[PDB]
Design a protein around this ligand. Structure first.
Ligand SMILES: O=C(C1CC1)N1CCN(c2ccc(F)cc2)CC1
Lengths: 412, 412
């Protein structure tokens, strides 16, 4: 029957830090990671800022030889994965390598690489496409390259569920362990969509904040003056482990993963329904999966993208699931600081949820100057709130109406 | 414990036909769907042929306007999915819509859309990128659009495991049902990479047959004159269903999905190990999952890509797993006829494995004129072989060393 799953290692690249502790320091200090993009010329674009990873050194993780072959989103995914495995203390051996797998995902994948190689094709012909173009760009090659470098022979796969990827990746990797298919999974997501195609494509949809003259104030979930999401880069990885396996090796356990919910809105390609009906179905699935009274939830790390329709749908969902308890829990969007890491969003935010439990603090929703109509919950405006947190929920809701909810709680 | 999963509906686009029975008739006649690619200047390319879908009419499924928003790989996945749901006779209601989900995947996704939107960006700058570029290209939009069209509120996700995608999609959807997270799933995959970037990208790796003079002889799994795989387009979808749910509504049951195995080679980015140790672990994992002795396997739909090293690894893996039975079972690669549909390969090949069971015939490996060193198994060279088939395996072994095996059995 179903086994318990705990978090024993975590790894991150975000716009706030080159690891977890430096990123977390930023979150708790209400620091923005959003800045004008320096890696290309955006003067012809309607949005010229985002959350970049600053000063990423791939040579802390990989030979410049292996690294040259890999898109930035794969490099980010590997960096976070390597951090997570080291942080876990896990040693890979002949006795366990079949029982350790990986599920690292991306929503968009290797958009920089495909753009560059598409440009080569068009200006110079097919003989200029890099030999490494396919293995170096396709989304499953975080899982692939990690398994080759560490000798992981367990379940090996990748999700792509747009803005829900990281949450689904962690949730389904827990099911792998819960059901006996593996004892350990490295799970999360990675994204680097800041190329002409990414900024251009989201721009053409008018989905992005155009607050070019105050980029740090752009991402303002539930604020009446929000005008779309901020595009952000990075990676989150967690080592998920069966409880007895963790106990048997004296693993440090951060928290327990008790609940996972999925649902489909079956509403619209890009817009959530105004009432958040699918988000509510998804949270209720996760809470039943965790065997919880909804009143046990202390903290929600919202999806909280800073889109008009997205932010208000989450309020409706939370009110619908939690009723009067909606006024007692704390809910925050760390996207206020990090921006929207798309497929990596659920991965970094699962990590913020686990540290929320470790340190007993709800991170702030920065830039929440004027909450909108009906956004009257404890949204942890401006400043981090120390408080009791036994159960934390992490929500993701993406294109295609695809919802994920993770439930973590303190481990004793 | 666990619930039983049956196949009640199937749908397909392949280089052999615009549905299952037309595709299946080509398979059993040993017809090739491989030809020079039309409406495209491939002069500068080392490979100029593949498996195109011929005469596809999206307006049987979608309005011209809704089709304009979607890459061909999404149109193909939606076509196969609609076929599969129609073939199952399932009726979606408020009483069951939360129990019906989708997992349709792709390995490579929207190369065509990326090409067209690159052209706009490079020629006319970012403002000429299509507003539907992102939602009309992301891999999870087959799952997304299908769920919106049919009102499906069950688990909604998409895998991307390169050439293993359709195998993993079907297996993990089967688990959703086995473990009570859903009663019904539409699962499989779709691909349209037989375009400039696909022929160019795989071409730059020299992974493709260059037999331009005789495209129909290019795909020759286990033949001593093979020189790599053939790029093909299409899609497969299956309606997976809990047994009692299928029995209660009087569903037609094609066969039972009894086993699913996964493994990672942890060996190389593109090359399998010489002895196919990973493929061996995976097939063993799948037989254990089904509670079956290797002696009970009658038919294997091989990965059989027509790569030198891939084909020989699968022979070694099958000898290793089946020992004294390796010669009594029949194994064929339908890629000899369809080419390699990448993430859709596992989807169409599972349908062919289900139809092998229904029709008690092993499909041929065409073009197997001169078996190579050690390729002395019953590879069903040239012509279909009627025979007793109670148990059928379908193997997929993809880039990153990601392995999947499905086990189907006759149901009565
Ligand atoms: O990039 C690849 C690999 C072939 C290189 N694929 C996965 C991500 N796909 C994608 C494009 C736009 C977009 F908005 C989201 C996803 C494109 C196909």
């Amino acid at each position: 029957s179903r086994r318990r799953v705990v978090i024993t290692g975590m790894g991150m690249l975000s716009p706030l830090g080159l690891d977890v502790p430096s990123s977390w320091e930023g979150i708790l200090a209400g620091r923005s990671g959003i800045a004008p993009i320096e890696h290309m010329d955006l003067s012809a674009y309607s949005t010229r800022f985002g959350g970049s990873v600053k000063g990423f050194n791939v040579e802390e993780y990989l030979s410049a030889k292996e690294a040259r072959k890999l898109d930035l989103f794969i490099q980010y995914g590997l960096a976070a994965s390597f951090q997570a495995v080291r942080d876990s203390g896990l040693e890979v051996t002949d006795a366990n390598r079949e029982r350790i797998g990986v599920s690292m995902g991306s929503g968009i994948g290797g958009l920089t690489n495909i753009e560059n190689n598409c440009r080569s094709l068009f200006e110079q012909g097919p003989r200029r496409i890099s030999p490494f173009f396919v293995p170096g760009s396709i989304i499953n090659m975080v899982s692939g390259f990690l398994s080759i470098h560490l000798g992981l022979q367990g379940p090996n796969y990748a999700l792509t569920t747009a803005q829900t990827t990281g949450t689904h990746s962690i949730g389904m990797a827990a099911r792998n362990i819960a059901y006996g298919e593996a004892d350990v999974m490295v799970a999360g997501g990675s994204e680097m969509a800041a190329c002409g195609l990414g900024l251009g494509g989201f721009g053409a949809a008018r989905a992005l904040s155009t607050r070019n003259d105050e980029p740090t104030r752009a991402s303002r979930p539930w604020d009446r003056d929000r005008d779309g999401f901020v595009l952000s880069d990075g990676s989150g990885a967690l080592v998920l482990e069966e409880l007895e396996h963790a106990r048997a090796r004296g693993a440090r356990i951060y928290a327990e993963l008790v609940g996972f919910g999925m649902s489909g809105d079956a509403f619209h390609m890009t817009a959530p329904p105004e009432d958040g009906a699918g988000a509510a179905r998804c949270m209720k699935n996760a809470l039943r999966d965790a065997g919880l009274d909804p009143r046990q939830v202390d903290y929600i790390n919202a999806h909280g993208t800073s889109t008009p329709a997205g932010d208000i749908a989450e309020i409706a969902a939370v009110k619908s699931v939690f009723g009067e308890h909606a006024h007692a829990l704390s809910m925050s969007s760390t996207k206020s600081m990090t921006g929207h890491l798309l497929g990596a969003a659920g991965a970094v935010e699962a990590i913020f949820s686990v540290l929320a439990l470790r340190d007993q603090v709800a991170p702030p929703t920065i830039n929440l100057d004027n909450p909108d109509e009906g956004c009257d919950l404890d949204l942890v405006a401006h400043e981090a709130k120390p408080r009791k947190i036994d159960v934390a929920l992490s929500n993701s809701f993406g294109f295609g109406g695809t919802n994920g909810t993770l439930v973590f709680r303190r481990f004793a």
